[PDB]
Design the sequence.
RNA sequence: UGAGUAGCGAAAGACGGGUGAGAAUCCCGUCCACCGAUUGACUAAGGUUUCCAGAGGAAGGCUCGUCCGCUCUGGGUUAGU
RNA sequence: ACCGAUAGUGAACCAGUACCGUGAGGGAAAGGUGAAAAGCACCCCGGAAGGGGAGUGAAAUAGAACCUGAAACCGUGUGCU
């Protein structure tokens, strides 16, 4: 099938309400002092506790 | 099976044999998260075989290991079945299970695949 | 007082860049650097160099401290399009648009 | 699938070459028209 | 006469000059019998053999405009006595 | 606009060491897999420098690319049989 | 009391040219910094492209993708709903 009518900019932007990405999900490393992903090793000094 | 890893039956068994053998040689390798959770069972059941030491245990482990040669030490060469029965199994005589540890790294460029580190405890 | 930096004619589609720009708009400078380094999208390293260039403009050209800074503005604008073709079946060709964007980031001390 | 054009250097010169056009009266008119046009190449 | 145009100074020709061989650029429409008599008349030596070859024009470009280089004819001269046909 | 939608052109890769601003994709090594009346070796037609070395990453390569049949500079084809 | 770059010759510019066809033959698009190159020494982020200052100039939102710079279309921030 082919579209019957042109899609307006109002309808197009409504459809993109939920099209987006999320936050990485990061925590602070208490050896590096810098940010890292949860349950992943630090990348500054390469340490993983626990 | 358990998880098919996007391979046929013959390819899956050949790839687990290659990953398991290379881990004995270097004791620390980097791979994919999904692959690492299936290598666990393969390597850990091979260490159980090397802790028995019988001839039948040796011949049942030669059906999974590959014929590589390790000239890493400065002394005489040895294969990967001599290292499994001689050195690795020597230092696990006390703990019962859990000879492998997995550490997460993160996504890799160009693929987004989760990278992990797998090593012997 | 505000400082700014611009990256011009970046060979990435404009609406793929804008997804990343939505996360760092309004955050502290130290927090925005960490978000960009941990997001696994193609345009994250590109935007990383634009924010770093603007931060260093606030320290040499002006007299501003990089502890009280925030990301004031972050937007993408369209650039020239590169026109290509793709051979389809039955002897027909289809056009391909390789798009381009301009990226601007402004960092403000406040006030 | 076999296509129409199978190249051959000898046939190209013997059918469309300079000496073939000159060896007849209607082929000399072809060369005269391509000089009034200003073409960079006269024959093949 | 002045059949010869220029000498050839390259890596391969340098390895030739260690075994009494000399590489020149000659006129595009001469045979190696004329080249044989031209070398002995100028440098006063005794030639023993001449080998000769041709190269096609190459496609070249600068800016937008495309053209072709000159075609050339190369001669390698073997002597039995004498040397130092250049510095 | 359709829409971040269809597709990305028959197939087995895995790990270690390097280089690098940046590596699933480049170089080296090991194991494994495929053809073998041919995916091997010559060669006529046709194409016309696509051949070699040192450099480069704007565009082309249906992804990436530090790499190339792509870009720059310099080279290479020798007959009395 | 002809045209002023979709006009005027197909061609104001390296045009019967790029390109297309075995061949006869068919055939485009592309003008404009500044009065004067005086075409941005030097510092900072980066591998580079790109940019922020400092200088030239009457003017740099005149920086060679350069006089003026409309509409479609794409974005950021805000008063009322």
Sequence:
């Amino acid at each position: 099938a082919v579209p019957k009518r042109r899609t307006s900019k109002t309808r197009k932007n409504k459809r993109r309400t939920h099209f987006k990405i999320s936050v990485p999900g990061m925590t602070e490393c208490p050896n590096c002092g810098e940010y890292k992903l949860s349950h992943r090793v630090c990348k500054n000094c390469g340490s993983y506790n626990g | 099976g358990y998880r098919k890893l996007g391979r046929t039956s013959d390819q899956r068994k050949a790839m687990l044999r290659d990953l398991a053998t290379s881990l004995i040689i270097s004791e620390r390798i980097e791979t994919t998260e999904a692959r690492a959770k299936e290598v666990r069972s393969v390597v850990e059941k091979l260490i159980t075989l090397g802790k028995k030491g019988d001839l039948a245990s040796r011949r049942n482990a030669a059906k999974t290991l590959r014929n590589v040669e390790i000239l890493n030490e400065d002394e005489t060469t040895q294969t990967a079945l001599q290292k499994l029965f001689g050195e690795i199994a020597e230092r696990y005589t006390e703990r019962q299970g859990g000879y492998t540890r997995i550490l997460k790294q993160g996504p890799r460029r160009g693929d987004g695949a989760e990278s992990v580190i797998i090593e012997l405890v | 007082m505000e400082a700014k930096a611009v990256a011009r004619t970046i060979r990435i589609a404009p609406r793929k860049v804008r997804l990343v720009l939505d996360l760092i708009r309004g955050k502290n400078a130290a927090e925005a650097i960490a978000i960009l380094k941990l997001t696994n999208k193609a345009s994250s390293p590109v935007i990383e160099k634009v924010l770093m260039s603007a931060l260093a403009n606030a320290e040499h050209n002006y007299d501003m401290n990089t502890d009280e800074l925030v990301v004031k503005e972050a937007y993408a604008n369209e650039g020239p399009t590169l026109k290509r073709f793709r051979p389809r079946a039955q002897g027909r060709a289809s056009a391909i648009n390789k798009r381009t964007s301009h990226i601007t980031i402004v960092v403000s001390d406040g006030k | 699938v076999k296509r129409t054009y199978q190249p051959n250097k000898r046939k190209h010169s013997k059918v469309h070459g300079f000496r073939k056009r000159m060896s007849t009266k209607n082929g000399r008119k072809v060369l005269a028209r391509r000089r009034r046009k200003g073409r960079k190449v006269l024959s093949a | 006469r002045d059949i010869l145009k220029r000498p050839v100074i390259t890596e391969k020709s340098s390895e030739a000059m260690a075994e009494d061989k000399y590489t020149f650029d000659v006129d595009t429409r001469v045979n190696k019998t004329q080249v044989k008599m031209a070398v002995e008349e100028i440098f006063n030596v005794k030639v023993a053999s001449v080998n000769i070859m041709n190269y096609k024009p190459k496609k070249k470009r600068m800016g937008r405009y495309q053209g072709y280089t000159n075609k050339r004819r190369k001669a390698i001269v073997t002597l039995k006595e004498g040397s130092d046909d250049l510095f």
In short: Helices of chain B lie at 9-26, 33-50, 55-61, 80-88. The first helix of chain B runs from residue 9 to 26. Chains B and E do not touch (no CB pair under 8 Å).
